[PDB]
Amino acid sequence: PSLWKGLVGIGLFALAHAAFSAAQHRSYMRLTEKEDESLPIDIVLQTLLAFAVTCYGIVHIAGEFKDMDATSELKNKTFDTLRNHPSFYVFNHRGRVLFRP
Amino acid sequence: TRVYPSKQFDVLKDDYDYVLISSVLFGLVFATMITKRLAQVKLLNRAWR
Amino acid sequence: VTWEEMRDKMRKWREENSRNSEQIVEVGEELINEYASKLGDDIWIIYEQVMIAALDYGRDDLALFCLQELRRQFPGSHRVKRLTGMRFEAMERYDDAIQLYDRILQEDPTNTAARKRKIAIRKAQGKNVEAIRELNEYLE
Amino acid sequence: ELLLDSNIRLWVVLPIVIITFFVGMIRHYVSILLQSDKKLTQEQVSDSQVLIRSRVLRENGKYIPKQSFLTRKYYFNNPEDGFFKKTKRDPTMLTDMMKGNVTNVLPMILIGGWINMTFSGFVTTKVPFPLTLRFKPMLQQGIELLTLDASWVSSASWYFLNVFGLRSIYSLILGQDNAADQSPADTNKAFKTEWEALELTDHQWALDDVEEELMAKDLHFEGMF
Amino acid sequence: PFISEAAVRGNAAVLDYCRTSVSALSGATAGILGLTGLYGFIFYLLASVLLSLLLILKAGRRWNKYFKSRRPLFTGGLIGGLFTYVLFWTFLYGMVHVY
Numbered sequence: 058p059s060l061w062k063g064l065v066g067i068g069l070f071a072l073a074h075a076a077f078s079a080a081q082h083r084s085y086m087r088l089t090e091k092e093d094e095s096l097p098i099d100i101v102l103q104t105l106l107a108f109a110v111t112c113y114g115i116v117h118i119a120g121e122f123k124d125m126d127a128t129s130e131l132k133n134k135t136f137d138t139l140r141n142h143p144s145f146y147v148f149n150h151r152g153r154v155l156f157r158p
Numbered sequence: 159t160r161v162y163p164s165k166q167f168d169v170l171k172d173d174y175d176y177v178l179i180s181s182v183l184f185g186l187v188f189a190t191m192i193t194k195r196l197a198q199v200k201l202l203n204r205a206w207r
Numbered sequence: 208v209t210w211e212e213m214r215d216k217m218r219k220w221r222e223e224n225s226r227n228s229e230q231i232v233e234v235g236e237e238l239i240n241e242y243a244s245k246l247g248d249d250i251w252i253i254y255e256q257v258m259i260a261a262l263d264y265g266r267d268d269l270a271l272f273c274l275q276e277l278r279r280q281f282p283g284s285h286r287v288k289r290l291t292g293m294r295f296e297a298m299e300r301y302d303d304a305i306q307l308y309d310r311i312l313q314e315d316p317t318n319t320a321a322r323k324r325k326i327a328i329r330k331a332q333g334k335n336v337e338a339i340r341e342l343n344e345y346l347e
Numbered sequence: 348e349l350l351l352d353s354n355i356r357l358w359v360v361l362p363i364v365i366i367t368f369f370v371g372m373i374r375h376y377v378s379i380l381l382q383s384d385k386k387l388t389q390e391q392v393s394d395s396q397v398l399i400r401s402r403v404l405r406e407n408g409k410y411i412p413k414q415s416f417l418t419r420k421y422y423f424n425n426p427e428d429g430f431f432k433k434t435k436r437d438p439t440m441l442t443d444m445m446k447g448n449v450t451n452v453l454p455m456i457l458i459g460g461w462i463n464m465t466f467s468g469f470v471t472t473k474v475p476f477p478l479t480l481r482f483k484p485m486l487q488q489g490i491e492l493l494t495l496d497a498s499w500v501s502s503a504s505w506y507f508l509n510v511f512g513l514r515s516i517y518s519l520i521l522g523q524d525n526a527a528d529q530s531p532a533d534t535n536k537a538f539k540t541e542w543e544a545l546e547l548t549d550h551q552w553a554l555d556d557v558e559e560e561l562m563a564k565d566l567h568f569e570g571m572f
Numbered sequence: 573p574f575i576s577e578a579a580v581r582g583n584a585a586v587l588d589y590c591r592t593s594v595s596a597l598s599g600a601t602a603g604i605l606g607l608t609g610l611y612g613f614i615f616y617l618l619a620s621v622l623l624s625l626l627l628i629l630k631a632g633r634r635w636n637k638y639f640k641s642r643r644p645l646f647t648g649g650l651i652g653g654l655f656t657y658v659l660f661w662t663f664l665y666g667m668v669h670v671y
């Protein structure tokens with residue numbers, strides 16, 4: 058369904074928010090200068106979950122596969138279509154006379 | 159004062175050409191738009207001949 | 208029933224060469240009258256089918272409209288030249304169509320549409336033997 | 348770490364990415380604009396299509412009975428029939444093709460040189476993996492530091508990394524087999540090699556055993572609605 | 573049986589699009605997390621197999637008519653994915669952790 062597309066959007070948004078959080082946390086260190094050297098569990102969990110949902114949505118957004126066997130889409134092609142030959146059309150048929158000229 | 163023993167490697171230069179970088183950005187995005195229109199028109203004309 | 212739906216239906220009906228001239232001409236007229244500006248150049252290929260259907264449908268009134276629009280948009284175009292040739296053939300005007308196709312051939316020799324249209328004229332005239340000979344020569 | 352200037356991001360990091368992206372788009376659109384089909388006369392297209400037919404016959408003549416196939420063979424490669432025997436015949440084009448081939452990489456290198464001059468003397472970003480010290484002279488052009496970690500990169504090599512890592516994005520957005528990246532002439536010899544090859548080819552009518560392989564299983568019929 | 577060039581080309585194109593998108597996203601995520609050095613590269617491989625699993629789910633059953641074999645699902649355009657992964661990794665690790 059189309060909602061899949063919407064899903065991926067929020068995923069990116071989630072990732073974007075993670076970035077902001079990470080940036081802020083970096084400022085934290087740039088003002089604390091302590092031996093933490095570790096991201097908050099909340100931000101990494103949020104980033105990983107956003108990655109998972111965004112990838113799952115993207116896989117759907119990629120599209121639908123197509124079968125290799127050439128007789129798949131040609132199965133429904135009745136003989137009433139392949140014979141038309143659009144380049145070799147002739148307009149000397151009963152259609153013109155029968156219909157309004 | 160301040161001293162830069164390494165020519166201030168980690169700071170933007172005072173003589174940065176803002177009026178050139180911004181100009182090239184916003185005169186090249188427009189160039190991309192114009193060339194996209196040109197490519198579409200040429201493709202249509204080649205298809206129709 | 209949105210213009211995208213009939214656009215997709217027309218695309219399908221063009222991908223496989225159908226000849227239900229009535230249905231395709233009705234859908235094309237609706238598209239070019241109500242939703243002409245709703246989409247871009249993708250109607251232009253439609254403007255081909257719409258006239259051909261007209262020549263198949265016999266409703267010549269919009270054939271002139273489509274032809275004039277295409278000609279005013281695409282002057283000196285071999286595809287539009289063949290399309291004018293079909294318009295001429297719609298009323299069995301064969302000499303002018305043959306002259307136009309000869310002019311197209313002398314302007315561009317690698318064009319394949321003109322030969323097909325001229326042999327279609329020949330087979331419409333009933334000269335089956337000469338049409339077969341012309342096709343044999345063209346395939347060579 | 349290093350307390351890099353924040354203004355280096357808004358004017359040396361993002362503009363490089365934007366420049367690379369839109370220069371790739373510009374290059375692809377200029378490439379499609381420049382391409383013009385060379386005029387072909389009747390003889391060349393005719394012989395090309397004839398050899399096309401010959402090759403497709405060689406590929407899948409198995410679905411054609413034996414007599415039709417060996418009559419094809421007589422027509423193609425046999426003295427008496429005559430076909431394949433009585434069928435044969437600073438310059439501007441070289442300069443144009445050389446310029447077209449050159450314009451696929453050289454604009455990227457010229458953009459790189461212009462970027463290296465314009466954005467010389469910065470430290471733009473830290474490459475997150477420990478590159479070797481011997482790679483220092485090309486990653487850190489325009490920096491006089493000696494003990495600086497090799498993972499810090501100047502503007503030119505950052506742009507190079509951007510142009511290397513953006514081709515997949517180009518294929519993603521522009522379309523499949525796009526032209527924005529970084530990376531028959533003779534018919535007589537073609538006629539002779541087709542002669543020899545189709546001489547070497549054999550026949551295997553694939554319909555000799557279709558019925559028996561069809562009789563084995565019942566015909567699929569569901570989904571008739 | 574009878575492979576059709578258009579369908580196999582479309583399948584290759586959709587697989588390449590999915591791989592490129594997932595590699596770019598994985599680069600962005602690795603830059604966000606601040607992974608540095610070999611520990612980063614391994615993550616990419618992990619991301620790749622994750623995508624493979626998803627592709628296995630996407631192809632699902634009866635995939636024999638979609639691909640000759642599952643191999644392009646796993647190693648299809650791995651280097652092309654790696655280049656974009658490292659680009660986006662550097663991008664995000666630069667505009668998140670460096671500043």
Ligand SMILES: CCCCCCCC/C=C\CCCCCCCC(=O)OC[C@H](COP(=O)(O)OCC[N+](C)(C)C)OC(=O)CCCCCCC/C=C\CCCCCCCC
Nearest residue numbers: 118364516518519520521522523585589593596597600663
């Ligand atoms: C945080 C870092 C993440 C990086 C983001 C990259 C991954 C995000 C990607 C995709 C999500 C968007 C989903 C919308 C559906 C689009 C595809 C679709 O099924 O819908 C169809 C239409 C038209 O199909 P098409 O011919 O245009 O597609 C090309 C056809 N094919 C793939 C066979 C070549 O799609 C359209 O509406 C036209 C628009 C097509 C998609 C535009 C997205 C690309 C724009 C920017 C990518 C990166 C540029 C800036 C990054 C610089 C950082 C270094």
